[PDB]
Design a protein around this ligand. Structure first.
Ligand SMILES: CCCCCCCCCCC1=C(C)C(=O)C(OC)=C(OC)C1=O
Ligand code: SF4
Ligand code: SF4
Ligand code: SF4
Ligand code: SF4
Ligand code: FES
Ligand SMILES: [Ca+2]
Lengths: 905, 584, 197
């Protein structure tokens, strides 16, 4: 299409509306109610331009550019005097009731309303009357509510309801008393409620966790990092100030997590700021804890390692690729053990084999929203991979999108799309041990044990393709529902099969692979998604090694006298008693970690590693994409006695001191090149980010904004002399403003979005080639593996039905978004949000034991009698007992595990 | 059409002459808010374009400015030739009362331009500074050596990839530079300094017991006569332009104060006028009158300092005490108005920081009654002394040709008989509404002639203050523009729109739309100009400051050659320079 | 509470104490500053030297062009990288006893010029006795710094002769002026409104 803006010709896409087309060209139109992800509704009337019928037209007409299609040969004007005066009048009308709140408002300096008030040039107030006020609600521990600052742009309700699928937020009231919130005080129920702080263009919804230790946006030090709280790998911008992590903002990745995080990623960063973290290396001498510097800790550790006869290394899926590789190099490939259980490692390896050998394309998180039918097998995605659940909701609304497109309704006119697609939606079939949070939009929900879910998947694969193995013992109504699933999936142009390793069953993953193969054989454009557990689970699976049980037997039999545990608490992957016995038997335990774990009581040496905020590295997400996270701040800048290094730096210097009796604090690119040379399956991680020599016209990339303040006074209480600026030899970023963050810079790693006149999160529009699309010059991250030409075979190992045996109790996993991730549990703000641990029981089983709802029962596993109060779960299958995974004492290795001595306390 | 409107200046006769001489495709005309025709010339045609402008019927006789620009990070270069770097040449035709900027584009690898020293002899120091701060080579330059940084300096500080902040201090570098200073006199080679050839060699500096700064002069002597002399400058280099690339538009005003520290608001004036050109701000008349008031008060302060310093350099010691009492009276008024003495930082984008305090007219009337009897006493006690006249008259004289070819402005140029004052030729800040004369010399610029012209300028500034006191407008002290930084304080404190504008203007900075502006003013020591490039951001993309003391110090060897050393001291005392103005 | 050049107590017969007091009195009542002009702070210094302020009343007007005859080095201006070896050489050329006053934010810390060509404070390479904030400090602030230096000089112990006695220099650890004036500064309630004169 061709448009003429202010007499200048432009070539745009005709399917877009005028506002997004003009913002993609760099033109500045003020706007409030439109969002690139939510569509156009034409409420705020801020985006007004003047449209003319032809070139020889002088009068024109004011139109909303967000609601005007960018048709071919469209003549408009933004800088028309009438349009400018109307946009100024809209800003003024918004400003009549706005509170005098900017100094004491957390959105100041990050406010879209401030930016558009300045952009319209409106700075004189001629309104002399009273301003309306509102009471505020309590929205829980995460979101702070300030209703006075609202401009009634309806972004919150549209996002939270039409996009996120939440139910408890809404718009109440009338003419100019419109209220946006919950009907009563209470916590926002959605797992994606945290994106309201970026969706809201004003200070109504604010980050309460940030509002505790508040600082303005110009005062933050930012870095482009990857969220470490599950395997999705959403791009984040951690921002720090005064040596502590202050905020997690969304970082735009048009291929992964474009505008939206989940609440675990956004608010579960509080473990970084804990005061019990290791900040110096500590050596045990009898009962004494001697604090060492880097050099003497490395010398003593390498000497004791040299006197040892066999050193084993226990990695972790929390650690980066470089740190796991450095441990593998230090202890040797044959002595390296992945720090996960044998069943967990088997499920992880099977998921990786399906992803990179099954011949079926695995979509990115953004690409999930374009699929026509979704089958989720055994994976509670809302609690384990939440952004996948959000993308599944978008893919479900794709049917309403297609129905509206059949009636020649444009894709940005969201109200008409929702009107045409009333309740018609794409087929969604979820299977779990109980009800999921996707049940409100699911076409069918199957509450069954993991064997029965696997048998359902194998039956679906057999009915789609008769070459697949059959299932014997299917009930006729279950067969009818299976047939419903089969005709829904076979009629889909782009079916999607989602599973993962959190189900605790190998057969569920095998059944999902069988369904995907059966759909691939029919010619469908099938995609497969596997949800892992931790941030670098796929990286640890690609690296390979032994299981944690093998390392425990190596420690117990005395074949290994030295163990180096990297970023692993060892209690989430094995029993605590056996781990404690093996670590007490081992004469040398060296724990390289950044969190105070329980295994440092018996550890001979504790190396104060860096977390993601204080380190660089690479992580492989659930779809096999290598992503580089960068260090946010130097921990030794404010506390000069802090020796907190990267884990790969610790292990590489330990290897160098073990070999040549000399420390070597290496560079990140050297470890990256070592990974690429030694492990060819991880050769793609070289291209995740450019090396430390990367420059933009000769200068580095800035971590902090141009107006970063207090540089001669933040450390003046320690010493009036300004310290040396921390040098960054590992990466292309600098710990200063002396760098580049231009939106037109040829790069893909963007620490934060800021353009002049756009201080809000809306500056990501300036950082994209087209708004709502990809990052300009490509999104960061590279897929490690391509789709194989030939797939796997059908898995003939069809499990039997779940048999409830007396005495035994099958543990059904119950994951929680706030409580299943270890570091997220360590965050103090999650302690109020996380629920009290309830053991879930069937009504029939609770009647059999005679226990009611709320009474405490005690059960023993691995000789550990623990007590929990009972919650009645009707959707659970009899013979199963539900356990909340990741919680206090309930390790996630209990999925699929049997249970003994379930008795009332 | 306001004065700040973006003009292309295609109706200038110089554009038609250039088109008729070199053809229509030989150059590109850029539309700016600088007020001058900006013409991008090809590099190979630069010397003939400069010669053609020098041979015009009313020629461009003065090279006003010559400096570089790093355009690698400039995003809004629409209609501009492709350039990793550029070099601009600002030329002034006094007879036409016009000026033209010529810009030469340069690639990143091919950073060399033909030298301009043959057409204009004052291009030498400008090309040395452009090489020093940008790495731009000038082919045919006699001694292309560093002029601000020491010779053992790596990198070019005004480039975009150069880190602006201070490096970590090291005693090793201080000890090495002390050893270099100690062995400098032992291993002095008069070939790297641009000199040639009983010829004594002496160093005047680097420390100097005077009030104009501390700088070093290498003197070649035949007995008492000065055969050759080059100045070693850059000892007072504060990196003010690089700070222009690091501050916001509003928070850079205190840095503009300290360019020449005897001027204050006189130094603030061209910067805020250029920023108001970038912002599209037409300030009201009371703002113009207040800014003229403060500029003339600081002009009287600076001229009293200059006359006292000259008299003390001659040898009389008492008038400096008396004129410092007069400076105390001026400082009392300035302290009452702005709150500070010599770096007020009171001018704002769109106006001034506060209104005039109630009672300022009493202090102005007291100073206006105090000044003239004291000035007459200074004249009759020192300026009419025949010993002072013998020490001053005939010392370092030059005509209009030497003043034009060296870029000499201010009292020296007008002492050569050229009636070129910025306040009359190219009026700014409502200077047309004041009745004042421009004193001129007979055609020869002595030390004594320059000093008496500064005395007459002081009297004319007293006349301006009298007219301003008798006719004071009532109105706003800030413009009503949305880009007036900061907004008026009471509206900020009780209106949310004004609070939002204030919040974003003081924190992130005011957003100047992408343009280029230029303001030239008649400062206390000559012509002071600000050339501002905005890339659409809250910071300046380029802040070029042309100061007159640089040009006067470059004119120093061409006027004192063949004279004595006491004549050199008197000439230094009568130039009206400060080393901060030289190095900035 | 002293400093020996180590934190020691006061080393101070009663005739030696009187002689030391007489020497300190003569030293603090006759302070000869060195004539050294760096930047605008020097202009305010020499303004204090003139008739309207009359720094001669304290006996500190003999402004020497030779560092040998000067007792006080007033670093009044920016410590540029090219000027820093000159400052160090001129400080080294002075004779015992010698005192240093940093005048202005540039000489204190670098001030507003945290830039590539400025040394961030003159205490990076010479020891400073009295700091003056301000940009520029007004002339009476320089006078007040002179009285602070006089009070510091009057309570320091130096050897009377280079052949007899302890040759170490004992400088008193004065109470900070911030802590001394905190009593009267916090008690301020109302100031004159800025709209008046
Ligand atoms: C070896 C030659 C010695 C000559 C006399 C030097 C001592 C008297 C200095 C007088 C003086 C001068 C010249 C002077 O210029 C000055 O102003 C800064 C003073 O302070 C008020 C002075 O005291
Ligand atoms: S929401 Fe924006 S405009 Fe409103 S008080 Fe906060 S910062 Fe100011
Ligand atoms: S609360 Fe925020 S997002 Fe919701 S309508 Fe008001 S301004 Fe818009
Ligand atoms: S979905 Fe996973 S990776 Fe994304 S923000 Fe949530 S916890 Fe982090
Ligand atoms: S502190 Fe201020 S007044 Fe003093 S030298 Fe520095 S810029 Fe000049
Ligand atoms: S953005 Fe178009 S009316 Fe709101
Ligand atoms: Ca690092």
């Amino acid at each position: 299409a061709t448009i003429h803006v202010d007499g200048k010709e432009y070539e745009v896409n005709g399917a877009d509306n005028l506002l997004e087309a003009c913002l993609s060209l760099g033109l500045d139109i003020p706007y409030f109610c439109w969002h690139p992800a939510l569509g156009s509704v034409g409420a705020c009337r801020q985006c007004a331009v003047k449209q003319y019928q032809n070139a020889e037209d002088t009068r024109g007409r004011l139109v909303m550019s967000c609601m005007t299609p960018a048709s071919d040969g469209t003549f408009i004007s933004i800088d028309d005097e009438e349009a400018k005066q109307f946009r100024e009048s809209v800003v003024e009308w918004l400003m009549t009731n706005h509170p005098h709140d900017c100094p004491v408002c957390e959105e100041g300096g990050n406010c879209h309303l401030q930016d558009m008030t300045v952009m319209t040039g409106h700075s004189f107030r001629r309104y002399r009357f009273t301003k309306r006020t509102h009471r505020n609600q309590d929205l829980g521990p995460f979101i702070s509510h300030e209703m006075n600052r609202c401009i009634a742009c309806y972004r919150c309700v549209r996002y939270y309801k039409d996009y996120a699928g939440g139910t408890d937020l809404g718009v109440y009231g009338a003419h100019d008393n419109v209220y946006f919130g919950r009907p009563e005080d209470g916590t926002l129920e959605s797992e994606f409620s945290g994106n309201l702080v970026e969706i809201c263009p004003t200070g109504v919804f604010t980050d309460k966790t940030h509002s505790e230790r508040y600082n303005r946006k110009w005062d933050m030090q930012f870095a482009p990092s990857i969220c470490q709280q599950c395997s999705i790998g959403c791009n984040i911008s951690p921002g720090e100030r005064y040596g502590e992590l202050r905020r997690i903002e969304n970082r735009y990745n048009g291929t992964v997590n474009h505008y939206f995080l989940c609440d675990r990623g956004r608010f579960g960063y509080g473990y970084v700021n804990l005061k019990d973290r290791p900040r110096q290396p500590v050596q045990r001498r009898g009962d004494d804890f001697i604090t060492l510097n880097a050099e003497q800790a490395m010398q003593g550790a390498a000497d004791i390692l040299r006197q040892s006869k066999k050193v084993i290394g226990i990695g972790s899926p929390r650690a980066s690729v470089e740190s796991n590789f450095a441990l593998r190099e230090l202890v040797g490939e044959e002595n390296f053990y992945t720090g996960i259980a044998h069943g967990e490692q088997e499920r992880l390896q099977l998921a990786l084999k399906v992803l990179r050998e099954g011949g079926i394309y695995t979509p990115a998180l953004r690409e999930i929203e374009s699929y026509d039918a979704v089958l989720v097998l055994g994976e509670d995605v809302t609690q384990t991979g939440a952004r996948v659940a959000l993308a599944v909701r978008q893919a479900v609304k794709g049917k309403a999108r297609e129905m509206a497109a059949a009636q020649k309704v444009a894709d940005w006119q969201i109200a008409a799309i929702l009107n045409i697609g009333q309740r018609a939606k794409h087929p969604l079939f979820v299977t779990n041990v109980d009800d999921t949070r996707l049940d409100d939009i699911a076409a069918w929900t199957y509450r069954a044990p993991v064997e029965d879910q696997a048998r359902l998947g194998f039956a679906i694969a057999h009915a789609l393709d008769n070459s697949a193995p059959a299932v014997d013992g299917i009930e006729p109504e279950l067969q009818s529902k299976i047939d419903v699933i089969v005709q829904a999936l076979a009629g889909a142009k782009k079916p999607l099969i989602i599973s993962g390793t959190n189900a605790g069953s190998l057969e569920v993953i095998q059944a999902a692979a069988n369904v995907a193969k059966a759909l691939k054989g029919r010619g469908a454009d099938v995609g497969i998604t596997m949800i892992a557990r931790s941030v670098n689970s796929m990286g640890l699976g690609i690296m390979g090694g032994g299981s944690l049980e093998e390392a425990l037997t190596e420690l117990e039999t005395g074949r290994a006298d030295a163990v180096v545990v990297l970023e692993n608490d060892l209690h989430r992957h094995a029993s605590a008693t056996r781990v404690n016995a093996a670590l007490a038997k081992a004469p040398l335990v060296m724990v390289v970690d950044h969190q105070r774990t329980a295994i440092m009581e018996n550890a001979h040496l504790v190396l104060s590693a860096a977390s993601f905020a204080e380190s660089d590295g690479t992580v492989i997400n659930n779809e096999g994409r290598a992503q580089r996270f960068f260090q946010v701040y130097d921990p030794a800048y404010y506390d000069s006695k802090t020796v907190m290094l990267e884990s790969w730096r610790w292990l590489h210097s330990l290897h160098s001191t073990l070999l040549s009796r000399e420390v070597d604090w290496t560079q990140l690119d050297h470890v990256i090149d070592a990974v690429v040379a030694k492990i060819p399956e991880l050769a793609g991680i070289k291209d995740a980010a450019p090396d430390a020599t990367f420059r933009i016209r000769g200068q580095k990339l800035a971590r902090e904004p141009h107006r970063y303040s207090g540089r001669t006074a933040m450390r003046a209480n320690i010493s009036v002399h300004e310290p040396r600026q921390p040098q960054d030899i590992d990466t292309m970023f600098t710990f200063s403003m002396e760098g580049n963050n231009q939106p037109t810079a040829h790069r893909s790693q963007v620490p934060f979005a800021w353009a002049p006149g756009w201080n809000s999160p809306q500056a990501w529009n300036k950082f994209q080639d087209e708004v709502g699309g990809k990052l300009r010059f490509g999104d960061p991250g590279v897929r490690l593996f391509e789709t194989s030409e030939n797939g796997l075979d059908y898995f003939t190992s069809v499990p039997a039905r779940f048999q409830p045996q007396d005495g035994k109790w099958r543990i059904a996993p119950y994951y929680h978004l706030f409580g299943s991730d270890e570091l997220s549990q360590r965050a103090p703000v999650f302690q109020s949000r996380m629920p009290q641990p309830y053991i879930k029981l069937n009504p029939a089983d609770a009647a059999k034991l005679g226990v009611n709802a709320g009474t405490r029962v005690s059960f023993s596993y691995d000789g550990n009698t623990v007590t929990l109060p009972v919650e009645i779960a009707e959707g659970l299958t009899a013979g199963q007992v539900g356990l909340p995974m990741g919680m206090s004492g309930i390790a996630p290795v209990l999925a699929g595990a049997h249970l003994e001595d379930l008795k009332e306390a | 059409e306001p004065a700040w409107q973006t003009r292309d200046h295609l109706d200038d006769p110089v554009i038609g002459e250039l088109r008729n001489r070199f053809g229509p495709d030989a150059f590109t005309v850029q539309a700016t808010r600088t007020g001058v025709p900006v013409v991008w010339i090809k590099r190979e045609q630069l010397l003939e374009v400069g010669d053609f402008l020098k041979k015009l019927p009313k020629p461009y006789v003065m090279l006003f400015d010559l400096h570089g620009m790093d355009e690698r990070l400039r995003t809004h270069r629409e209609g501009l030739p492709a350039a990793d770097f550029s070099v601009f040449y600002h030329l002034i035709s006094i007879d036409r009362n016009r000026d033209i900027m010529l810009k030469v584009a340069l690639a990143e690898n091919d950073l060399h331009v033909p030298t301009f020293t043959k057409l204009f002899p004052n291009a030498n120091w400008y090309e040395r500074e452009t090489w020093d701060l940008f790495g731009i080579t000038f082919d045919g330059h006699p001694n292309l050596r560093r002029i601000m940084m020491p010779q053992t300096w790596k990198g070019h500080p005004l480039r975009k990839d150069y880190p602006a902040r201070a490096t970590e201090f090291s005693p090793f570098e201080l000890t090495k530079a002390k050893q270099d200073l100690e062995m400098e006199a032992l291993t002095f080679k008069p070939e790297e300094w641009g000199m040639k050839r009983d010829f004594m060699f002496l160093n005047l500096g680097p420390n100097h017991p005077s009030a104009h700064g501390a700088f070093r002069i290498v003197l070649q002597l035949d007995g008492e006569e000065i055969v050759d002399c080059v100045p070693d400058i850059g000892y007072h280099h504060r990196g003010a332009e690089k700070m222009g690339e690091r501050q916001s538009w509003h928070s850079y005003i205190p840095y503009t104060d300290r360019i020449e520290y005897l001027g204050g608001c006189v130094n603030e004036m061209p910067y805020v006028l250029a920023v108001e050109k970038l912002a599209g701000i037409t300030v009201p008349d009371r703002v113009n009158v207040i800014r003229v008031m403060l500029s003339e008060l600081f002009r009287i302060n600076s001229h009293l300092l200059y006359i006292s310093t000259f008299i003390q350099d001659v040898g009389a010691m008492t008038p400096v005490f008396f004129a410092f009492t007069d400076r105390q009276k001026i400082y009392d008024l300035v302290e009452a108005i702005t709150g500070f003495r010599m770096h007020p930082a009171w001018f704002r984008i769109g106006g001034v920081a506060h209104d005039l305090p109630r009672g300022w007219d009493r202090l102005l009337r007291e100073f206006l009654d105090w000044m003239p009897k004291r000035l007459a006493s200074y004249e009759k006690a020192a300026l009419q002394n025949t010993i002072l006249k013998g020490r001053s008259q005939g010392v370092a004289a030059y005509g209009a040709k030497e003043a034009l070819e060296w870029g000499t402005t201010g009292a020296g140029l007008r002492a050569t008989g050229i009636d070129f004052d910025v306040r009359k030729a190219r009026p700014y800040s409502g200077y047309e509404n004041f009745d004042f004369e421009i004193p001129v010399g007979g055609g020869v610029s002595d030390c004594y002639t320059r000093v008496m012209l500064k005395v007459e300028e002081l009297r004319q500034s007293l006349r301006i203050l009298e007219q301003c006191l008798n006719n004071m407008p009532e109105g706003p002290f800030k413009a009503d523009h949305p880009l007036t930084t900061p907004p008026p304080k009471e509206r900020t404190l009780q209106h949310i729109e004004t609070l939002i504008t204030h919040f974003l203007q003081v924190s992130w900075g005011p957003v100047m739309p992408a343009n280029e502006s230029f303001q030239m003013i008649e400062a206390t020591k000559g012509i002071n100009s600000y050339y501002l490039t905005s890339d659409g951001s809250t910071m300046s993309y380029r802040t070029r400051i042309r100061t007159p003391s640089y040009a006067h110090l470059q004119q120093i060897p061409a006027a004192i050659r063949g004279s004595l050393v006491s004549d050199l001291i008197v000439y230094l005392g009568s130039i009206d320079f400060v080393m901060s103005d030289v190095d900035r | 509470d002293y400093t020996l050049t180590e934190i020691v107590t006061d080393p101070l017969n009663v005739f030696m104490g009187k002689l030391n007091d007489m020497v300190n009195w003569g030293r603090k009542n006759s302070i000869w500053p060195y004539n050294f002009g760096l930047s605008c702070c020097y202009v305010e210094m020499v303004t204090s030297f003139t008739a309207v302020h009359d720094v001669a009343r304290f006996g500190a007007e003999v402004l020497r062009a030779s560092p040998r005859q000067a007792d006080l080095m007033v670093v009044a201006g920016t410590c540029f990288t090219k000027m820093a070896p000159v400052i160090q050489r001129l400080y080294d050329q002075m004779l015992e006893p010698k005192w240093v006053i940093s005048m202005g934010a540039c000489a204190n810390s670098g001030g507003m010029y945290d830039i590539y060509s400025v040394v961030q404070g003159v205490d990076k390479f010479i020891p400073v006795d009295v700091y003056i904030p301000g940009c520029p400090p007004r002339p009476e602030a320089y006078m007040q710094a002179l009285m602070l230096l006089q009070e510091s000089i009057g309570k320091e112990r130096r050897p009377l002769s280079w052949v007899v006695g302890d040759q170490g220099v004992y400088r008193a650890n004065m109470q900070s002026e911030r802590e001394r004036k905190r009593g009267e500064r916090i008690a301020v309630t109302n100031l004159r409104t800025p709209d008046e004169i």
